[PDB]
Design a protein around this ligand. Structure first.
Ligand SMILES: CN1[C@@H]2CC[C@H]1C[C@@H](OC(=O)[C@H](CO)c1ccccc1)C2
Ligand SMILES: CN1[C@@H]2CC[C@H]1C[C@@H](OC(=O)[C@H](CO)c1ccccc1)C2
Ligand SMILES: C[N+](C)(C)CCO
Ligand SMILES: C[N+](C)(C)CCO
Ligand SMILES: C[N+](C)(C)CCO
Ligand SMILES: C[N+](C)(C)CCO
Ligand SMILES: C[N+](C)(C)CCO
Ligand SMILES: C[N+](C)(C)CCO
Length: 311
């Protein structure tokens, strides 16, 4: 909706001038959208800019006041003639790197030899977050990189690979909300169910989120590290009780013999018994270590070869 002006080439830069003033920021001119930055230099290619449409960075000229405003920034792609690529689905484009972004018309810069598929939201900005394609989920980075006083927005919108946390984000991470972990394979596909990664097992279920703590899967109980998620095996002291997990990871219930030593894991909960207890009417005694007392005396009580209290 910006008319009455004209594009002007000067000092190896391109401007749009009307009534003798330079256009700045976002402008819709003759069916196309352009962006002129803070001083009027038309941009081209990959750009990380404040979102258009509010009016605070729109239809402005360098002779007008520029309001202070807090607008999130997103990635946008402009043609070599400066027109905004109004894609709302996806498109194959030169990968964005530390050398082909933030450039303006007139500048010299290489055209990425590598091209990637980029997804877009309904407002022409590069899409971030989860996307479902051809039977699989992929995660497009919501955040860029940091590093003690430093922020690189380049990763935003790129296909995530490997271990990835899904933070709730707008302009900054939202620490109040949960941030589950996921694992994307070499091609970015989200893994589900059991998966062996770096030598350890993890359970991602059907949603993809990495489970932590006790987890019931296909009839058996498993215990994933409460913080890191890796599946535990063997004897585990959890919540002040002992549990025995098979090498497969499944929790054991009932009688279990380790070498010559018998142990009794509670029928339902699975916690190890100590002291006197009875199974199917018969009484047995387990020491504090959980080991069953056999062929000996326990406080004036005889227990035979099977640990049974012999009357
Ligand atoms: C990005 N460069 C181009 C536009 C600004 C800078 C420097 C050049 O532009 C200028 O030098 C401007 C043109 O009006 C200028 C300012 C003051 C004195 C002379 C020229 C090319
Ligand atoms: C390490 N355990 C976990 C993964 C394999 C074993 C047993 C359980 O997994 C399975 O039982 C199934 C059997 O098909 C399985 C899933 C994924 C890979 C291999 C086996 C939990
Ligand atoms: C998109 N999901 C299946 C991947 C993850 C939960 O939001
Ligand atoms: C699974 N991790 C990302 C969560 C933790 C350490 O490897
Ligand atoms: C999950 N349980 C049955 C295994 C243990 C108590 O938390
Ligand atoms: C069975 N008792 C007589 C042995 C022991 C207390 O429960
Ligand atoms: C782990 N314990 C309690 C089970 C057995 C003695 O080492
Ligand atoms: C299960 N036991 C302790 C009970 C008996 C030997 O098989």
């Amino acid at each position: 909706n910006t008319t009455g002006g004209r594009f002007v080439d000067k000092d190896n830069r391109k401007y749009y001038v009307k009534d003798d003033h330079k256009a700045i920021y976002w402008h819709k001119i003759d069916g196309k959208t352009y962006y002129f930055g803070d001083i009027g230099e038309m941009v081209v290619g990959w750009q990380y800019l404040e979102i258009p449409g509010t009016g605070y960075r729109d239809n402005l000229f360098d002779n007008q006041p520029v309001n202070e405003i807090g607008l999130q920034e997103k990635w946008y792609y402009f043609g070599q003639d400066g027109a905004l690529l109004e894609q709302t689905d996806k498109q194959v484009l030169e990968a964005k790197t530390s050398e082909n972004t933030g450039k303006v018309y007139g500048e010299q810069y290489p055209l990425s030899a590598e091209k990637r598929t980029y997804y877009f939201d309904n407002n022409y900005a590069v899409k971030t977050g989860w996307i479902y394609e051809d039977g699989n989920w992929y995660y497009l980075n919501k955040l860029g990189n940091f590093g003690d006083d430093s922020y690189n927005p380049l990763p935003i919108g790129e296909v995530a690979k490997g271990w990835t946390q899904d933070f709730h984000v707008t302009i900054d991470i939202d620490r109040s909300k949960p941030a589950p972990w996921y694992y994307l394979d070499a091609s970015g596909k989200m893994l589900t169910d059991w998966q062996k990664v770096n030598g350890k097992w993890y359970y991602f279920g059907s949603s993809g989120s990495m489970a932590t703590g006790w987890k019931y899967v296909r009839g058996k109980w498993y215990y994933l590290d409460n913080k890191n998620g890796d599946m535990k095996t063997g004897w585990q002291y959890l919540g002040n009780k002992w549990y025995y997990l098979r090498s497969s990871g499944a929790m054991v219930t009932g009688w279990y013999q380790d070498g010559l030593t018998w142990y009794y894991l509670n029928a339902g909960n699975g916690d190890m018994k100590t002291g006197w207890f009875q199974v199917n009417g018969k009484w047995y005694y387990a020491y504090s270590s959980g080991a069953l007392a056999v062929n000996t005396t326990v406080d004036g009580y005889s227990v035979n070869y099977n640990g049974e209290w012999v009357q």
